[PDB]
């Protein structure tokens, strides 16, 4: 469906005027919803963990990739709604959030790149999908060319992504030179015992992981996330993380790797410690993303990581979307718009939000306490599954470090709630304006999922036991 | 050109309530003494006296009690002990 | 006791000392948008190669090097 959407959309966006952008985006939003609901029944193919190799052994289809695919569609639906609908109908918000003409096509193509990364069974397909996603994401960074910071960001991103892509291509070709093969499926226990592939496979893993910004190469990505338009940051900080991490989890090429162990430790420490002194909202959220990417990196050191990883990535996607949407909503109550790409920038600008919108702060509290991992919110069960996995496999020191990093990051998670439940002198008296029904309903759905997902935990594990065993 | 919506009307946050007559006559000296005592941790420094109290209470006293408690574990049994019998088990 | 231990040492190994430590470490990790980042990526690649060479030699020898690296970055 995705290819058909891309083709049609190119035709229409060519033949439509600049005023039709939001209507087009609503059209695609509904189309993706329709695909998600009508084609969901293809799950049935994956009963008993049945795996399918497709396209001449280039693509691999199993329950895991089907789930990642559905999750990516859900994320795309939510993200496209933010562009397809106005928060408010005033002039200010027409200036604040207007979709570019080609933005939707870039979004769909980057989604296609991500899905091809997930399904990749062969290194040529992996490299082509990586380059497709990398190019589309460069352009998404750069499409808002009136922003000085966005253009500077796109250029830095181009160069860092190019270097990491060259590292990846080098790793692929060294694997070819040693094994005369482009598939990991050719690998076996005998082959891993016989030959020392550790260097090559770790170089490939590192080349992929530095593209989502794990320490000690974080800062360039945090700067890019800071300097992009806020509705762009909601996307570019999420989809590449999902695709790359899912590919690495599915491939399992760094089991018990000492280098990945040390880098995951370092990423946890830097993500937790470095986010403490932050005063800008989006830099705080980017360091949050770094710490959570560390939590997921830990899962690359062990076999049978499917359940913990899927649960964690789903709850993280929901929490991330929700926190960005809350920051977006809280824009209507700020008294100073900093600029047209990033209306709110400093955490202190939320001060006293509870007096303007009590339930917005309720939602904020719920999402923050999910991030900290307070039961019975989803975040707690995500961390619980991760701890179960790593302790089952004897990563004791890493478990201690994970404890410590969650503690430390709770400080700058609660910074947001702290300033949000403080008091502001000028308190909204009244307003005729209504927030858009659709986005408020979506934000509410995310909040209710985070709050009451745990009631379905046992049902989920029962389903999982029949589709992934 | 970027300004919040004119549609918003903001008034004061008043907390309401009945202003009671002020039944305490605050003493500035007492308040400063109280503030100094309350936030003493912000100004604590390691010196000879402070370090001495730290090393006594956090190190020497726990060590003494630990030696006592691990040396005397299971040593005594008193229930109904009679004349000539040892109240000690080892 | 009440001052030197309770509002002294226990707060050192508590909210206040941790606050100072985190302030310093965070300041150091935050303390030419391109050239610098490129130098970073080379330094990471070469440092990783040399560190793994050392690990192959003897893992105990690399622990002080990692400690020193973290001391550079955070302190």
């Amino acid at each position: 469906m995705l290819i058909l959407a891309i083709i049609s959309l190119i035709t229409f966006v060519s033949m439509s005027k600049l005023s039709d952008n939001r209507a087009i985006i609503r059209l695609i939003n509904i189309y993706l919803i329709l695909v998600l609901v009508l084609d969901s029944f293809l799950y049935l193919l994956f009963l008993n963990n049945q795996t399918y190799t497709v396209m001449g052994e280039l693509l691999i289809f199993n329950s895991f990739t089907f789930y990642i695919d559905m999750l990516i569609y859900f994320i795309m639906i939510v993200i496209s709604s933010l562009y397809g609908y106005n928060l408010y109908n005033n002039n200010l918000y027409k200036t604040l959030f207007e979709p570019k003409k080609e933005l939707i096509i870039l979004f769909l193509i980057n989604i296609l790149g991500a899905l091809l990364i997930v399904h990749s069974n062969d290194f040529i397909t992996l490299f082509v999908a990586i380059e497709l996603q990398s190019y589309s994401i460069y352009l998404i960074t750069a499409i808002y060319n009136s922003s000085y910071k966005a253009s500077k960001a796109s250029m830095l991103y181009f160069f860092m992504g190019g270097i990491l892509s060259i590292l990846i291509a080098y790793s692929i070709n060294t694997y070819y030179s040693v094994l005369n093969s482009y598939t990991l499926h050719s690998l076996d226990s005998l082959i891993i015992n016989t030959l020392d592939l550790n260097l090559i496979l770790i170089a490939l893993s590192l080349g992929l992981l530095f593209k989502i910004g794990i320490a000690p190469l974080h800062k360039w990505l945090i700067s890019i996330y800071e300097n992009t338009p806020i509705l762009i940051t909601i996307y570019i900080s999420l989809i590449p993380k999902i695709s790359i991490l899912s590919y690495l989890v599915l491939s399992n090429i760094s089991i018990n790797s000492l280098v990945i162990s040390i880098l995951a430790i370092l990423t946890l420490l830097v993500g937790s410690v470095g986010g403490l002194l932050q005063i800008k909202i989006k830099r705080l959220l980017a360091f949050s993303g770094l710490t959570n990417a560390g939590y997921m990196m830990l899962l690359l050191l062990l076999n049978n990581n499917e359940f913990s990883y899927l649960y964690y990535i789903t709850q993280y996607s929901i929490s991330h979307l929700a926190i960005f949407m809350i920051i977006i909503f809280s824009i209507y109550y700020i008294n100073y718009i900093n600029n047209q790409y990033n209306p709110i920038i400093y955490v202190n600008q939320l001060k006293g939000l509870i007096h303007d919108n009590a339930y917005l702060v309720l939602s904020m509290a719920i999402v923050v306490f999910s991030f900290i991992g307070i039961p019975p919110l989803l975040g707690f069960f995500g961390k619980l599954n991760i701890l179960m996995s790593i302790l089952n496999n004897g990563y004791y020191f890493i478990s201690i470090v994970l404890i410590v990093a969650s503690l430390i990051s709770a400080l700058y998670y609660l910074y947001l709630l702290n300033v949000s439940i403080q008091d502001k002198n000028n308190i909204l008296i009244n307003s005729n304006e209504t927030v858009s029904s659709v986005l408020s309903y979506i934000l509410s759905s995310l909040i209710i999922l985070i709050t009451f997902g745990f009631i379905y935990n046992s049902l989920i594990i029962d389903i999982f036991n029949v589709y992934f065993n | 050109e970027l300004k919040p919506s004119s549609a918003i009307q903001r008034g004061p946050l008043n907390k309401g309530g009945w202003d009671a007559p002020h039944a305490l006559h605050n003493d500035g000296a007492i308040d400063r003494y109280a503030h100094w005592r309350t936030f003493y941790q912000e100004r604590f420094k390691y010196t000879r006296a402070t370090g001495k109290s730290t090393l006594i209470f956090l190190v020497a006293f726990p060590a003494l009690i630990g030696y006592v408690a691990y040396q005397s574990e299971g040593l005594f049994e008193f229930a109904g002990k009679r004349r000539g019998e040892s109240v000690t088990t080892r | 006791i009440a001052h030197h231990v309770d509002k002294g040492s226990l707060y050192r190994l508590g909210p206040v000392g941790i606050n100072r430590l985190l302030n310093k470490a965070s300041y150091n990790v935050i303390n030419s948008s391109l050239s610098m980042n490129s130098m970073l990526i080379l330094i990471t690649i070469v440092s990783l190669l040399l560190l793994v060479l050392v690990m192959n030699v003897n893992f105990i020898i690399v622990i002080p090097v990692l400690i020193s690296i973290l001391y550079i970055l955070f302190s």
Partner: peptide
């Protein structure tokens, strides 16, 4: 005050000047 209680209103993290600000 910040998440550590530090003073809050150069490194990019604490830099306040805004090249995208409408007045610049």
């Amino acid at each position: 005050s910040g998440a550590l209680g530090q003073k809050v209103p150069m490194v990019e993290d604490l830099e306040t000047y805004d090249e995208d600000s409408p007045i610049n």
